[PDB]
Design a protein around this ligand. Structure first.
Ligand SMILES: Nc1nc2c(ncn2[C@@H]2O[C@H](COP(=O)(O)OP(=O)(O)OP(=O)(O)O)[C@@H](O)[C@H]2O)c(=O)[nH]1
Ligand SMILES: O=C([O-])C(=O)[O-]
Ligand SMILES: [Mn+2]
Ligand SMILES: [Mn+2]
Ligand code: NA
Length: 620
């Protein structure tokens, strides 16, 4: 069927067979092979041997180091220019801008970044032609969600990064079995390049191929494509995670009647064995992973982890909100993780785990700020910047957004239904972020509509998960500001529409604040395992216990309803204080934000809830 060789890159296939692929997967591979011009094509099978060999190969080349203190753990140090997400270089392409983001009155949108089809094609042509010269194109078949779940979705990621291949094996279900399950079905098309064709034009910093100048993370939902160039950092290069499972999936979810959210999923069991599942949306680096696998301090209580980051949720024909974790692993913030703060994480990351931008001890272990493990005298530390480090120095040993990438199956409290194809029934949804002032430890929304407004109103101190520096309290509706796949106003309408659904059992909505501080900047709440005390209250409220007092912002715990045994030094009045002054200002600021950023796309119900909150506050 050809006058010469065709577009047949069969000669360059070094694992698997293009003939073995489904026809559409083959076209995707060969088309991009012709564009990117890789030397070889490696069709990933996801096997232990493939993984081990690829890791040793990376080890040979000085791309990673083996951590000799642990069972099969590895360390990658990056170019300091490629350390986190970059929201300003993250774009969604649609025919109309307004389908992607509301048109902001003030001229600049805080809700996503749109690029025209025409501008994107120019950006694409300035980057990808020949970009994989001298490198292997890896073909990664992956499933988001358990294989054969009705809620699961398959993708194919093309990459020239062995680091991406290894990390995808942990964070997704990856390999031959995914291709077999896929058959001739549709798949999300994911294209990635580090953007450093050989021979190299500039020298690599720290053996980490990247192209910060041309870095662009693009989403084309109408073509079912994700196209990411120039960054190896996980959020930008593990295309199943933020790019697919939040951005693409949120819009699909809108179209099909389900939800794709930046939420942990956990099971909480009381001392008498009664169990419920909760979902929680906190902004990046605001405590989801610590909550999802919390070691509860309250005797008798148990927490089990379903997922720590992304939730796909859909009301079943019985009206239960069913959640699955679409990921296969945890891509968790390293700094702060200790036996004290997160004992279950520490046990998970003992083996089969890839660390990125943490420090290395002289005995082949890992180190970071807040690890809370003294080292023997004589043990020295290499920083994430590959230099000798002392606790003297005014510079952290690990990068603030350094990460572990670890299999979810190893979590000692992984929930028994964490791969159930039907999902787990959600009875409560928790919103929250970092608020140093004004917002009490916990409150409960008055209705679904108020609950959606509470999600929409979320604000949170900036973190190191993206490019944002300092401690400015930013707006982060639903913890989804960096991740909306479409118009935020339409997303709110979609959320509100859940109330009108066949027999839907709407979860109770809560808002929490672990991060309230006193005059001296000291946390008023110790948090971590002590947050079990907040979860107890939520549990009883879902059961219908009369443990709530009505305030202007919603229901708070009655006096003595929170179990504070073992925490008698906690200042309850300060922690739970609601100031008319603060809240007048808060509502005014929410008003102006929504009017500016959402305007004509703002649902009536949300504006109504705003008007109601304002009125309730005026009566204080
Ligand atoms: N003070 C306090 N700090 C916390 C608490 N929970 C988590 N943290 C810290 O906040 C940082 C980020 O927490 P994570 O649980 O990794 O945040 P995340 O929501 O999983 O972030 P992403 O994975 O980026 O979406 C870590 O350094 C934690 O130690 C808490 O209850 N109280
Ligand atoms: O990496 C993450 O999970 C994030 O940035 O939210
Ligand atoms: Mn996240
Ligand atoms: Mn996390
Ligand atoms: Na390196």
């Amino acid at each position: 069927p050809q006058l010469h060789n065709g577009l047949d890159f069969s000669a360059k296939v070094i694992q698997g067979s293009l003939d073995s692929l489904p026809q559409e997967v083959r076209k995707f591979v060969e088309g991009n092979a012709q564009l990117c011009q890789p030397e070889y094509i490696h069709i990933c099978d996801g096997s232990e041997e493939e993984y081990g060999r690829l890791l040793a190969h990376m080890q040979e080349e000085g791309v990673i180091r083996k951590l000799k203190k642990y069972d099969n753990c590895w360390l990658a140090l990056t170019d300091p220019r490629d350390v986190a997400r970059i929201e300003s270089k993250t774009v969604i392409i649609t025919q109309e801008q307004r389908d992607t983001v509301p048109i902001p009155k003030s001229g600049q949108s805080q809700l996503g970044r749109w690029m025209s089809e025409e501008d994107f094609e120019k950006a694409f042509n300035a980057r990808f032609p020949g970009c994989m010269k001298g490198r292997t194109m890896y073909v990664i078949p992956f499933s988001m969600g358990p294989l054969g779940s009705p809620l699961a979705k398959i993708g194919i990621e093309l990459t020239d990064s062995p680091y991406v291949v290894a990390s995808m094996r942990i964070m997704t279900r990856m390999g031959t079995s995914v291709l077999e399950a896929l058959g001739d079905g549709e798949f999300i098309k994911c294209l990635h390049s580090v953007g450093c064709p050989l021979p190299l034009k500039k020298p690599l910093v720290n053996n980490w191929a990247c192209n910060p100048e041309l870095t662009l993370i693009a989403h084309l939902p109408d073509r079912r494509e994700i196209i990411s160039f120039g960054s190896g950092y996980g959020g930008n290069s593990l295309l199943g995670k933020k790019c697919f499972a939040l951005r693409i999936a949120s819009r699909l979810a809108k179209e099909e009647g389900w939800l794709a959210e930046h939420m942990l999923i956990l099971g909480i069991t009381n001392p008498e064995g009664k169990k419920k599942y909760l979902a929680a949306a906190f902004p990046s680096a605001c405590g989801k992973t610590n909550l999802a696998m919390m070691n509860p301090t309250l005797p008798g209580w148990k927490v089990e982890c379903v997922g720590d980051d992304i939730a796909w949720m859909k009301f079943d024909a019985q009206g239960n909100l069913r959640a699955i974790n679409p990921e296969n692993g945890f891509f968790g913030v390293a700094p702060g993780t200790s036996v004290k703060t997160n004992p279950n994480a520490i046990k998970t990351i003992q083996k089969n785990t890839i660390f990125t931008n943490v420090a290395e001890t002289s005995d082949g272990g890992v180190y970071w700020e807040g690890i809370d493990e003294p080292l023997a005298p004589g043990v020295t530390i290499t920083s994430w910047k590959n230099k000798e480090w002392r606790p003297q120095d005014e510079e952290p040993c690990a990068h603030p957004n350094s990460r572990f990438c670890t299999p979810a199956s190893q979590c000692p409290i992984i929930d028994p239904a964490w791969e159930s194809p039907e999902g787990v029934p959600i009875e409560g949804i928790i919103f929250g972020g970092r608020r140093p002032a004004g917002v009490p430890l916990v409150y409960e929304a008055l209705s679904w509509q108020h609950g959606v407004f509470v999600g929409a109103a979320m604000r949170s101190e900036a973190t190191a998960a993206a490019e944002h520096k300092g401690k400015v309290i930013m707006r982060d509706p639903f913890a989804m500001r960096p991740f909306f796949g479409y118009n935020f106003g339409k997303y709110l309408a979609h959320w509100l529409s859940m109330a009108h659904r066949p027999a839907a059992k709407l979860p109770k909505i809560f808002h929490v604040n672990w991060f309230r501080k006193d005059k001296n900047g000291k946390f008023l709440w110790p948090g971590f395992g002590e947050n079990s005390r907040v979860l107890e209250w939520m549990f009883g409220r879902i059961e219908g216990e009369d443990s709530a007092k009505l305030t202007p912002i919603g229901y708070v715990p009655k006096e003595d309803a929170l179990n504070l045994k073992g925490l008698g030094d906690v200042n309850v009045e300060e922690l739970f204080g609601i100031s008319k002054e603060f809240w007048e200002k808060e509502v005014e600021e929410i008003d102006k934000y929504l009017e500016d950023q959402v305007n004509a796309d703002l649902p009536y119900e949300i504006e109504r809830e705003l008007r109601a909150l304002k009125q309730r506050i005026s009566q204080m």
